[PDB]
Amino acid sequence: FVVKDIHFEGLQRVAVGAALLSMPVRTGDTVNDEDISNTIRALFATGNFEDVRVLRDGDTLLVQVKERPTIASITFSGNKSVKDDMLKQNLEASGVRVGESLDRTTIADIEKGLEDFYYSVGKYSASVKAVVTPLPRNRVDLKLVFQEGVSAEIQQINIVGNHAFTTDELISHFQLRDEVPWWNVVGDRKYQKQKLAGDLETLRSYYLDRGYARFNIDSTQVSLTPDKKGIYVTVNITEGDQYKLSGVEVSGNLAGHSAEIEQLTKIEPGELYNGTKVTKMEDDIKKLLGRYGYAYPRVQSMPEINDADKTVKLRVNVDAGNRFYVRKIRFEGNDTSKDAVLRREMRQMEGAWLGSDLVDQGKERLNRLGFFETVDTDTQRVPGSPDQVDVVYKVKERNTGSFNFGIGYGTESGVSFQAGVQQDNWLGTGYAVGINGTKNDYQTYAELSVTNPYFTVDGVSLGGRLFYNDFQADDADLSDYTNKSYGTDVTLGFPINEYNSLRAGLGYVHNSLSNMQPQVAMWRYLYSMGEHPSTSDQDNSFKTDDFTFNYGWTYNKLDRGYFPTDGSRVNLTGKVTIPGSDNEYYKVTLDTATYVPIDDDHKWVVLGRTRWGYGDGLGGKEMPFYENFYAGGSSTVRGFQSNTIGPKAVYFPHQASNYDPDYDYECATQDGAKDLCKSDDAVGGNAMAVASLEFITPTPFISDKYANSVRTSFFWDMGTVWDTNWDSSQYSGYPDYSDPSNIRMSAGIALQWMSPLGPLVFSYAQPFKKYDGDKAEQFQFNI
Amino acid sequence: CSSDSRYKRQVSGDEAYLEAAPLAELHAPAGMILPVTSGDYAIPVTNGSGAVGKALDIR
Amino acid sequence: LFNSEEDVVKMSPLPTVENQFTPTTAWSTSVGSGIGNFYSNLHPALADNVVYAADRAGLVKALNADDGKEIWSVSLAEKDGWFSKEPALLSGGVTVSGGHVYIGSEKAQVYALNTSDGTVAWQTKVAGEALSRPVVSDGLVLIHTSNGQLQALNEADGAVKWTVNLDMPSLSLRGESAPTTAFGAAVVGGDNGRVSAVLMEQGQMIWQQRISQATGSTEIDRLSDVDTTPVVVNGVVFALAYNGNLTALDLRSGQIMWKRELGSVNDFIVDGNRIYLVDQNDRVMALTIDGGVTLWTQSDLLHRLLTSPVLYNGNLVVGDSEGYLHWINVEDGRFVAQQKVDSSGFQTEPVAADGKLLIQAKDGTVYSITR
Amino acid sequence: ERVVYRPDINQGNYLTANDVSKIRVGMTQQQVAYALGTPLMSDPFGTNTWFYVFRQQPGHEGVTQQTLTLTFNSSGVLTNIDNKPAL
Amino acid sequence: EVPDNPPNEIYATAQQKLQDGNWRQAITQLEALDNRYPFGPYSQQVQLDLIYAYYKNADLPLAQAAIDRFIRLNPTHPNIDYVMYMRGLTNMALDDSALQGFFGVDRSDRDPQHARAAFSDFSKLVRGYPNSQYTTDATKRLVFLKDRLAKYEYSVAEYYTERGAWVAVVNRVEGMLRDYPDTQATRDALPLMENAYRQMQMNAQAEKVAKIIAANSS
């Protein structure tokens, strides 16, 4: 029989002629009942025909095709700890997905494979069921319910072959631990069989360091304890004998650095053997020959273990390579930055032999850049010569800009706001930006600050800082506390070492004042300004244009420029006035940042911060009171309200402020309180020694896509600010504030979120030791 | 909820490489002849079909 | 955190609690502690009116089986080391044959203690652990190790007669393939779904048959705990293949008389031609010796954690790891009694020896139960 | 100038004097390229003159330099070993 | 949220939102068409409009996956020339889209990663389709890009001058020499290796450039 036509009754994925080519009974070919049955399997061999019924109208074939394709969706339900795409990856591992055909046979198989996925991850007591939900025209949904009973968790290792150490101390020598108490609670307890392998290498290291060179692990068998949780193991090892480093017989392509090689053979003959130091001394060669240019310094140790005296001799084979491996370097991730600004951040030069750490030193400048999220190296030895390594640097950049704000003093009673924004090297163009200000009907404060750190290749760091505050305390007029304060700061940054770095600059500041408060230290400073004011009236006006020399110094051995982890950046700052200034005083300030990794995989890191600061006169006219030290709120201490730490104001019994409202502002005036009024306004002290105890904690509660950016840290702060000239003969009814014992204290937690245009920090903090007069807001926004 | 009524103001793109200026070749005297093209820098230069810029294929 | 995100699996309870022959105890003496959470293939032993009881990590009694009064005590909680009086910590069940107490530790030591005081008749460290209690007989401490080694020791000193490597899975697929002696050949099953026969007198493999499937590319049950200890009535062996599968096969050749590759049974006694079982889901059934043909069944109890099924007072007696004890018809599955005798639960096996019935709770161990 | 801290500027592509002894005029480029490899410079339209040339800036005082040009002919066979110090 | 509708109407629905510019909803139509009918006769024409509306709504990694789809789905097609531009047209906007040029700042010092990719695709376009409607357009894309790659490497060669690594000056400009004549930044780089020459005291070699300087000052 020869077919007249094949009737393609429903395909839903495949073409008509593409269905015809799968048929061995195609139009024009002789058709028998065998090739009809060959057509059943071959249309089933498409992998997309659910049922195939090859029939014919005499000879005109007609195939009742039922079809499995597209699964329109796969619906996951009940996982709750594992991602469903990971389960879809197991479904990807079956080659089945949205778009694919369904197979009722592979339902239990993928259910097995997901239970085998359950088997692998750390469970076995977890079952699944795939619910086929059929959809229009051929389609099906794979609803999937995940009936997870319980995981498998470790119970007890047995170690056999151990004859020098405790199994239980080796648990404490292993990552896998089985100890979280109820009244001595510490840590957590999990299982994964890859950790078993890592604990074996941990043991392999644990016998390597002693000299156990006849040591070997025989095997290790996990008890398949019949509860679907019970993880006990045996560990079969051979303890082996102790061996002692009796000598090294290093040789090979020594490249003439054999004395420098011999410096890396500085050992004691007969000390008990460790191979990690042998591993370490091998690396130092690759750091020795690495800075000597050898990008592939093949080093091969061989422990010639001598069982006759229970010692080990040390063959070490050396291949050097060449020096001028480094041809050039490439840069990637300059897409929003300037390349030379990136390319200035290196110390291994093209046209040179390799400096291995010079990469890393350059990568440390990349690391202490801080305008990045990754800085990575791609050390491509270019084919054609082994004098050709082109090292690509794909880096991931970071966000820029940082805004701060507090909605206050209007926004409906007029146009009034806080302001302030950065631009963080101005999108990495080479121009550090920090600008702030505020426009209100209390004051008009303006400020500019801009820094090119790199005007020259010599690190010429031109920092120009400006401000123009029309600080008037505008309640009716310039009658309460006025200062039009303005001036500049030209400042240069100075390289002193790769880590030592000086700061110095010149500051101008011109201040014009009017009708100031019955604050008496304010009068006292006016009296130390050689001025004799009316203490009972705010009518006293003043112009001052101060002239100062500014200085400072920076250390930098601390990990990242944005997310550091270990080390220190010691930051001296200070200032002093000059001849020609109307006031002769000084001010010096010391703030630090010491980072100690608690965890050295850095799940926990101690962070050490203090703030030392002191400024006073050079004789006669002193440091002004607005240059004192003011804290609380956030500044480095939370729990309080801002600038609420320090000595507090007292009002002189006052008559006429040039503003006597209807009991709106109380300034010991004739609107009430016509007497001495000690107020709670922290007017700051001329000496500050504050600190905090802040510690890195992780966050296991979110996606770590962004937790790596998020800082989670609890802080524990304290403080004492005071003025050295406080002479309580004059403050006989007042607490003395020449005391370095005004001991405040607060503690709390830091919540930094890294938004895509700067960090968003928030905190709550509760003080529980405090010298009063302070204003407190226990919740803080730290944007 | 709603973000209508001119959500973006003067936000678009252009065809700046077409708006850029063309180039001009460089001369080497007799004896200073060095290789000048190292890859796909050699292209077939073409007025293969125009209608460029905004007149290019949109759909 | 961890208490609120808890995932729970659910089993069926114990139905039809009966008291038609209302149970009691003869005594409890117990020992105190034992298994607890710490799962092992330890189980008690009883002979000569001497309860061979002990704490697993601790004391080694001898209790007089009239009241469980202490005949003597020793302890393997001694002999200072890293633990400094290193605890007992036993793997296998108790064996007392002759004047020795044969026991194999989780410290991979085996012991012979003189049964009149517990004075150590001899000592041997066993190479690795054992998945099997030693069937100490014929001058041989017949051991299936965790390493899969047929280590026979001369039971007069522990002198290693041989150490013969056995069938080996990937990890310790838990189950006792106890090396059993039958008609002069060492008969062992295997936790890799395989069975074998070995020469008892030299450790020479008579035959070895893979039977059934195991975890790794065909993953199998962990609520079924396969009693891969083979029991041998005449030379058709009747034993379990790991994953629980039932198989009858020649002892001389390993050639299959019949097999149930449908088995997921836990603990088994070939009781005549009514082979009594504990299923994975803990339905009881009586199966033939010609097939897995149900003479009677009992799906009444379901989804508990049982011990081995024993026959005592004419009734099928099983306890569980719940603390319940159950008295089933030796015929069709009828509860003759039931006793929630404790809540410590029973992982070990009931010992219906000396005409008694010796059980061991997890840390409340011995209740000599009568009715 | 009068400034103090100037971090030192370095440059390799510079072989030892033993490597100068390793070769001779009349060697091929390849005879150098087996033992001393390639330099990082040769003439782009001129001859095969190879350039293993040292440069380094020391503190406050000029730049050290060891120029070494290696004139091969059109056959790439050495015709001049030309070394130059700083200045 | 798009229901299973008539697919030609879905083909019509996005076509409005293309002309409307609602590629927030045109692509929302365009996915569910290809989520249900990806092998339709216009579903590959949907792919051309998918790359279009991805480009219109600025969805280049979503576009670039769809470009490699049409590689796999239509390895032979007449409309490859559209996509072969649209591959480079992606890599044009993939290389530079940012706001820095809005401040008059010249972004030819930024990383020409996709500019190297857009250089490849348009050169493959003028080779694979030397007569297409883009072949005049893609040329001037490649014309400026050759100097954009030059002013990139010119920016590299500047830094090495103030570094003073005069060899690394020469290796950059020889790379510039090996890649393009016609960039006039090469004329700008022309004296600098000659300056590096006399800085390396390669004065005789600097004389050779001085003739090329004489050749390329005029």
PDB file of C-alpha atoms in Angstrom, chain C residues 137-219:
ATOM      1  CA  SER C 137      31.114 -19.574  68.675  1.00  0.00           C
ATOM      2  CA  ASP C 138      33.300 -22.442  67.410  1.00  0.00           C
ATOM      3  CA  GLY C 139      36.379 -20.917  69.027  1.00  0.00           C
ATOM      4  CA  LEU C 140      35.798 -17.828  66.888  1.00  0.00           C
ATOM      5  CA  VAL C 141      34.665 -14.313  67.683  1.00  0.00           C
ATOM      6  CA  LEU C 142      32.717 -14.044  64.432  1.00  0.00           C
ATOM      7  CA  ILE C 143      32.521 -10.336  63.589  1.00  0.00           C
ATOM      8  CA  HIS C 144      31.137  -8.279  60.736  1.00  0.00           C
ATOM      9  CA  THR C 145      32.875  -4.932  61.050  1.00  0.00           C
ATOM     10  CA  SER C 146      31.858  -1.457  60.040  1.00  0.00           C
ATOM     11  CA  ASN C 147      34.814  -1.850  57.691  1.00  0.00           C
ATOM     12  CA  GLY C 148      33.158  -4.978  56.338  1.00  0.00           C
ATOM     13  CA  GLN C 149      35.783  -7.300  57.760  1.00  0.00           C
ATOM     14  CA  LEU C 150      35.208 -10.884  58.818  1.00  0.00           C
ATOM     15  CA  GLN C 151      37.537 -10.737  61.784  1.00  0.00           C
ATOM     16  CA  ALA C 152      37.484 -14.003  63.676  1.00  0.00           C
ATOM     17  CA  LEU C 153      39.278 -13.921  66.996  1.00  0.00           C
ATOM     18  CA  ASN C 154      40.186 -16.893  69.126  1.00  0.00           C
ATOM     19  CA  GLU C 155      37.638 -16.390  71.895  1.00  0.00           C
ATOM     20  CA  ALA C 156      40.113 -17.696  74.470  1.00  0.00           C
ATOM     21  CA  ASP C 157      42.418 -14.690  73.961  1.00  0.00           C
ATOM     22  CA  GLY C 158      41.068 -12.657  71.076  1.00  0.00           C
ATOM     23  CA  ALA C 159      43.764 -14.070  68.806  1.00  0.00           C
ATOM     24  CA  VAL C 160      42.788 -13.019  65.294  1.00  0.00           C
ATOM     25  CA  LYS C 161      41.980 -16.171  63.354  1.00  0.00           C
ATOM     26  CA  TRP C 162      41.573 -14.125  60.179  1.00  0.00           C
ATOM     27  CA  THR C 163      40.322 -10.743  59.053  1.00  0.00           C
ATOM     28  CA  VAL C 164      38.442 -11.101  55.774  1.00  0.00           C
ATOM     29  CA  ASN C 165      37.181  -8.046  53.902  1.00  0.00           C
ATOM     30  CA  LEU C 166      33.504  -8.162  53.031  1.00  0.00           C
ATOM     31  CA  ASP C 167      30.904  -6.623  50.715  1.00  0.00           C
ATOM     32  CA  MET C 168      31.088  -2.863  50.995  1.00  0.00           C
ATOM     33  CA  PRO C 169      28.644   0.014  50.423  1.00  0.00           C
ATOM     34  CA  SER C 170      29.464   3.707  50.206  1.00  0.00           C
ATOM     35  CA  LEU C 171      28.682   4.739  53.784  1.00  0.00           C
ATOM     36  CA  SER C 172      27.470   2.887  56.842  1.00  0.00           C
ATOM     37  CA  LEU C 173      24.028   1.853  55.645  1.00  0.00           C
ATOM     38  CA  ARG C 174      22.867   0.943  59.130  1.00  0.00           C
ATOM     39  CA  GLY C 175      21.713  -2.619  59.680  1.00  0.00           C
ATOM     40  CA  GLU C 176      23.186  -5.691  61.345  1.00  0.00           C
ATOM     41  CA  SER C 177      24.460  -8.264  58.910  1.00  0.00           C
ATOM     42  CA  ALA C 178      25.468 -10.514  61.774  1.00  0.00           C
ATOM     43  CA  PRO C 179      27.870 -13.298  60.795  1.00  0.00           C
ATOM     44  CA  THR C 180      25.743 -16.349  61.529  1.00  0.00           C
ATOM     45  CA  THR C 181      26.903 -19.957  61.644  1.00  0.00           C
ATOM     46  CA  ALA C 182      24.957 -22.632  59.814  1.00  0.00           C
ATOM     47  CA  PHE C 183      26.094 -26.220  59.119  1.00  0.00           C
ATOM     48  CA  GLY C 184      29.771 -25.211  59.142  1.00  0.00           C
ATOM     49  CA  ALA C 185      29.626 -22.176  56.835  1.00  0.00           C
ATOM     50  CA  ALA C 186      29.677 -18.521  57.828  1.00  0.00           C
ATOM     51  CA  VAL C 187      26.354 -17.064  56.707  1.00  0.00           C
ATOM     52  CA  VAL C 188      26.195 -13.276  56.458  1.00  0.00           C
ATOM     53  CA  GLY C 189      23.729 -11.078  54.634  1.00  0.00           C
ATOM     54  CA  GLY C 190      24.886  -7.589  53.758  1.00  0.00           C
ATOM     55  CA  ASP C 191      23.851  -3.977  54.149  1.00  0.00           C
ATOM     56  CA  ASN C 192      24.600  -3.276  50.482  1.00  0.00           C
ATOM     57  CA  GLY C 193      21.527  -5.228  49.377  1.00  0.00           C
ATOM     58  CA  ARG C 194      23.738  -8.287  48.897  1.00  0.00           C
ATOM     59  CA  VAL C 195      23.967 -11.702  50.567  1.00  0.00           C
ATOM     60  CA  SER C 196      26.728 -14.273  50.853  1.00  0.00           C
ATOM     61  CA  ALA C 197      27.959 -17.516  52.336  1.00  0.00           C
ATOM     62  CA  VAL C 198      31.497 -17.808  53.677  1.00  0.00           C
ATOM     63  CA  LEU C 199      33.454 -20.738  55.064  1.00  0.00           C
ATOM     64  CA  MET C 200      33.098 -20.495  58.823  1.00  0.00           C
ATOM     65  CA  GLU C 201      36.345 -22.304  59.490  1.00  0.00           C
ATOM     66  CA  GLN C 202      38.644 -20.123  57.429  1.00  0.00           C
ATOM     67  CA  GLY C 203      36.692 -17.151  56.124  1.00  0.00           C
ATOM     68  CA  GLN C 204      36.464 -18.437  52.550  1.00  0.00           C
ATOM     69  CA  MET C 205      33.563 -17.063  50.508  1.00  0.00           C
ATOM     70  CA  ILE C 206      31.284 -19.964  49.616  1.00  0.00           C
ATOM     71  CA  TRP C 207      29.139 -17.732  47.434  1.00  0.00           C
ATOM     72  CA  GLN C 208      27.975 -14.137  47.352  1.00  0.00           C
ATOM     73  CA  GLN C 209      24.780 -12.803  45.807  1.00  0.00           C
ATOM     74  CA  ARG C 210      23.805  -9.220  45.219  1.00  0.00           C
ATOM     75  CA  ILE C 211      20.064  -9.127  45.779  1.00  0.00           C
ATOM     76  CA  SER C 212      18.562  -5.723  46.211  1.00  0.00           C
ATOM     77  CA  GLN C 213      18.865  -1.987  45.866  1.00  0.00           C
ATOM     78  CA  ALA C 214      20.510   0.559  48.160  1.00  0.00           C
ATOM     79  CA  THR C 215      21.013   4.339  48.444  1.00  0.00           C
ATOM     80  CA  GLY C 216      23.114   5.830  45.688  1.00  0.00           C
ATOM     81  CA  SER C 217      21.442   5.934  42.234  1.00  0.00           C
ATOM     82  CA  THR C 218      18.481   3.927  43.580  1.00  0.00           C
ATOM     83  CA  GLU C 219      17.769   5.388  46.979  1.00  0.00           C
TER      84      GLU C 219
END
